[PDB]
Amino acid sequence: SEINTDTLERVTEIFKALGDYNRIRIMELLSVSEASVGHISHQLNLSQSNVSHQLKLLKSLHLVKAKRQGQSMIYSLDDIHVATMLKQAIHHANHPK
């Protein structure tokens, strides 16, 4: 329950932030496997500056989280709701209509 105006505004901000091709590419990468900024940048052919900027935004909205491992920051989808939202959307885009 607890669907009030504030909730739907935050939901709106989540979808607004995800309405970005490169952010979707970052999120899909993290949906397959957690990764560092250097690995995301290398895999997607995006600069480390840019990846870091987008991940600061995604983190502020609780869409990714980060932990320090050895020397680096490892990012992941924040929790199972974010993973489920994303994978359900990808499958829906993919399956025939």
39 is in an annotated binding site: no
- CA distances (Å), origin 39, targets 44, 69, 76, 91: 8, 14, 12, 25
53 is in an annotated binding site: no
**Partner interacting with residue 72 (select from Zn ion, Cl ion, Na ion, none; CB below 5-8 Å by kind):** none
Taking the complex as a whole, the smallest distance from the CB of residue 31 to Cl ion amounts, in Å, to: 9
φ and ψ of 15, to 5 deg: -70, -35
Crossing angle between the packed helical segments 21-32 and 5-18, to the nearest 10 degrees: 90
* Residue among 40, 46, 55, 82 that touches a copy of itself (CB under 8 A): 82
Report how far Cα 26 is from the mean position of its chain's Cα atoms: 6
Residue 15 CA to residue 85 CA, distance in Å, equals 11
Which residues of the chain form contacts with Zn ion (CB under 5 A)?
A: 79, 81, 92
Which residues of the chain form contacts with a copy of itself (CB under 8 A)?
A: 2-3, 7-12, 14-21, 24-25, 28, 62, 78-79, 81-82, 84-85, 88-95, 97
Binding residues for Zn(2+): 79, 81, 91-92, 95
